[PDB]
Amino acid sequence: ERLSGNQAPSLYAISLIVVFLCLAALYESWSIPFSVMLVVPLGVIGALLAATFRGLTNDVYFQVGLLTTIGLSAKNAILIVEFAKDLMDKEGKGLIEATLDAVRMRLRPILMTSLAFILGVMPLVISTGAGSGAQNAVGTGVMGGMVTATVLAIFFVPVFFVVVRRRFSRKNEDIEH
Amino acid sequence: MPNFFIDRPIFAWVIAIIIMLAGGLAILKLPVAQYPTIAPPAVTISASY
Amino acid sequence: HEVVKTLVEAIILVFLVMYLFLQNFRATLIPTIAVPVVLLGTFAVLAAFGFSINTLTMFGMVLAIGLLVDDAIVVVENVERVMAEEGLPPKEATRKSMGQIQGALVGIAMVLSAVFVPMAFFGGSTGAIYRQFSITIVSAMALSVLVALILTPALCATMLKPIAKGDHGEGKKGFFGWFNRMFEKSTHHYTDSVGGILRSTGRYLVLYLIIVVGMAYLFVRLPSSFLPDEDQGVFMTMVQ
Numbered sequence: 365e366r367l368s369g370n371q372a373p374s375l376y377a378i379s380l381i382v383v384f385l386c387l388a389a390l391y392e393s394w395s396i397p398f399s400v401m402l403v404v405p406l407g408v409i410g411a412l413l414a415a416t417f418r419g420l421t422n423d424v425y426f427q428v429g430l431l432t433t434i435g436l437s438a439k440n441a442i443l444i445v446e447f448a449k450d451l452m453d454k455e456g457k458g459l460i461e462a463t464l465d466a467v468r469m470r471l472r473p474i475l476m477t478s479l480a481f482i483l484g485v486m487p488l489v490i491s492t493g494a495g496s497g498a499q500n501a502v503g504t505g506v507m508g509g510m511v512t513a514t515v516l517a518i519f520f521v522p523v524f525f526v527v528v529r530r531r532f533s534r535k536n537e538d539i540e541h
Numbered sequence: 542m543p544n545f546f547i548d549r550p551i552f553a554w555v556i557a558i559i560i561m562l563a564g565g566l567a568i569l570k571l572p573v574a575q576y577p578t579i580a581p582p583a584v585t586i587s588a589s590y
Numbered sequence: 591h592e593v594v595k596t597l598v599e600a601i602i603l604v605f606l607v608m609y610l611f612l613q614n615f616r617a618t619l620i621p622t623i624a625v626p627v628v629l630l631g632t633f634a635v636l637a638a639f640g641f642s643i644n645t646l647t648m649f650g651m652v653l654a655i656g657l658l659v660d661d662a663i664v665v666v667e668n669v670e671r672v673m674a675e676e677g678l679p680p681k682e683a684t685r686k687s688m689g690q691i692q693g694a695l696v697g698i699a700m701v702l703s704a705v706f707v708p709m710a711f712f713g714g715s716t717g718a719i720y721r722q723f724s725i726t727i728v729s730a731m732a733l734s735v736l737v738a739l740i741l742t743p744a745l746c747a748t749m750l751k752p753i754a755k756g757d758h759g760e761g762k763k764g765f766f767g768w769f770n771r772m773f774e775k776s777t778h779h780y781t782d783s784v785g786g787i788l789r790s791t792g793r794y795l796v797l798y799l800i801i802v803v804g805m806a807y808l809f810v811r812l813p814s815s816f817l818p819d820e821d822q823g824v825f826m827t828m829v830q
């Protein structure tokens with residue numbers, strides 16, 4: 365190294381913190397960012413399954429694809445709660461009412477992107493020939509991650525939000541203006 | 542800008558915090574010295590007879 | 591060249607998925623144009639920063655496609671929605687639409703840079719590898735936002751078909767009609783479901799916590815390496 369090693373935790377810890385901070389500013393809230401951060405695991409599980417089931421390894425290619433997968437599931441979660449939060453705030457719509465109207469408005473764009481990207485990386489996962497080692501490594505991580513993140517997030521995000529909204533509010537959950 | 546942040550105290554905080562930890566991080570990596578390089582560089586030619 | 595090729599295939603595959611949902615040539619063409627615009631611009635940014643075209647930057651391009659195409663989809667879809675939720679004409683619909691998401695797109699790019707920048711900071715030999723991805727991907731996202739604020743809206747306002755209030759092609763004859771019909775019902779099925787998960791909830795934190803321990807479980811198991819050995823069509827034999 366040697367010269368020392370294992371910088372991963374530090375840099376991802378700070379990465380985690382900056383993301384929370386950016387989300388705090390985005391929502392003007394210290395608590396709502398969690399209803400987005402909680403989705404991180406949802407893509408990682410899939411990336412881990414595919415890698416393991418395929419005999420792959422935790423390497424550069426696996427790390428970067430995961431960040432990408434986390435990025436997108438973060439982006440989907442952010443737009444969802446951004447829609448739910450606005451409906452409540454701008455319009456009067458109450459918690460549930462808005463969480464469901466948002467998630468429903470968000471389902472399609474989410475599926476369009478997931479399947480476009482999952483299909484897109486298929487060539488990589490299917491790759492043979494020069495550099496297929498790298499190509500396979502990149503593709504299978506992203507494919508696994510995108511699948512779980514996609515299916516899981518569309519259900520878990522609306523949850524994350526109401527649980528978080530309820531745990532850190534005052535009034536309320538009823539329609540209004 | 543002030544009016545913007547008067548209604549968005551949290552966003553104001555975020556900028557200040559991000560700036561602070563950027564500086565904390567900077568402090569770990571920054572070299573330490575009495576002075577920076579201030580002497581002008583010299584080259585010496587040495588020969589013997 | 592093999593990565594360039596999958597890059598092209600990925601764009602073709604994207605176009606076909608876009609078409610499945612947008613069900614129109616000119617609409618599918620919008621996200622399909624955004625991609626090559628951002629990617630090509632990225633090469634320019636790489637040059638301005640003295641990077642080279644290498645395995646890592648090329649894969650950054652590939653991964654960027656997911657981020658890129660998503661910016662475009664989000665913009666175009668939201669207009670398509672607006673237009674079907676009001677019957678606003680295309681030009682008017684994107685204006686309303688852009689004003690609605692424009693701020694989020696920019697905000698999201700910033701939260702995202704927070705997830706990719708940090709790796710530009712690994713130390714040693716290692717660090718130079720991760721850095722290729724950071725800059726490629728972060729740059730691409732930046733350009734993607736620019737493009738989403740400049741080309742995409744312009745393209746949306748001129749190439750999108752007027753949609754009538756309430757129309758969801760649900761009454762189109764052929765595959766689309768059946769697909770359009772299938773998606774709506776499935777959507778309601780989706781909303782219904784979520785509707786029930788919210789009436790409960792404690793059962794799903796349990797699930798989450800399973801997934802999380804599962805995740806952590808698999809992680810500590812998965813061996814770690816750096817870069818794979820490639821068959822490069824050559825090798826040597828030492829004789830001593």
Ligand SMILES: CCCCCCCCCCCCO[C@@H]1O[C@H](CO)[C@@H](O[C@H]2O[C@H](CO)[C@@H](O)[C@H](O)[C@H]2O)[C@H](O)[C@H]1O
Pocket residue numbers: 369370371372376379380383404422427430431434705716814815816
């Ligand atoms: C805002 C959300 C962001 C979420 C980010 C979380 C995703 C990232 C998780 C994967 C990171 C890599 O995971 C970890 O990487 C380091 C190296 O970098 C590995 O460490 C091992 O491999 C490398 C290889 O040179 C060595 O530097 C290191 O000394 C060695 O022990 C760990 O064994 C591995 O567990």
Ligand SMILES: CCCCCCCCCCCCO[C@@H]1O[C@H](CO)[C@@H](O[C@H]2O[C@H](CO)[C@@H](O)[C@H](O)[C@H]2O)[C@H](O)[C@H]1O
Pocket residue numbers: 594597625626627629630643
């Ligand atoms: C829409 C998708 C956008 C993504 C596309 C990305 C493509 C990636 C290409 C990487 C490899 C190309 O590598 C590069 O190719 C060009 C031409 O093809 C070469 O350039 C050479 O060929 C052409 C002619 O054929 C001459 O104009 C040029 O003067 C000459 O130097 C470079 O010397 C080579 O280094």
Ligand SMILES: CCCCCCCCCCCCO[C@@H]1O[C@H](CO)[C@@H](O[C@H]2O[C@H](CO)[C@@H](O)[C@H](O)[C@H]2O)[C@H](O)[C@H]1O
Pocket residue numbers: 386387389390391392552555556559560693694696697698700701
């Ligand atoms: C080193 C310096 C550190 C600075 C780092 C910057 C932090 C990251 C910024 C992310 C925020 C997203 O981007 C910004 O967020 C604010 C936060 O409410 C949002 O603000 C949005 O809602 C408010 C009202 O509540 C509107 O007045 C505003 O016009 C609108 O844009 C915007 O969508 C967007 O302009």
Ligand SMILES: CCCCCCCCCCCC
Pocket residue numbers: 554558561
């Ligand atoms: C009542 C005001 C609460 C504002 C909280 C600010 C938090 C500052 C954190 C400093 C972190 C270095």
Ligand SMILES: CCCCCCCCCC
Pocket residue numbers: 394558
């Ligand atoms: C980085 C530390 C930020 C802490 C913010 C806490 C805000 C609590 C106010 C309710």
Ligand SMILES: CCCCCCCCCC
Pocket residue numbers: 384394395532
């Ligand atoms: C990173 C720690 C963030 C703490 C946020 C606490 C939110 C309290 C809102 C009342």
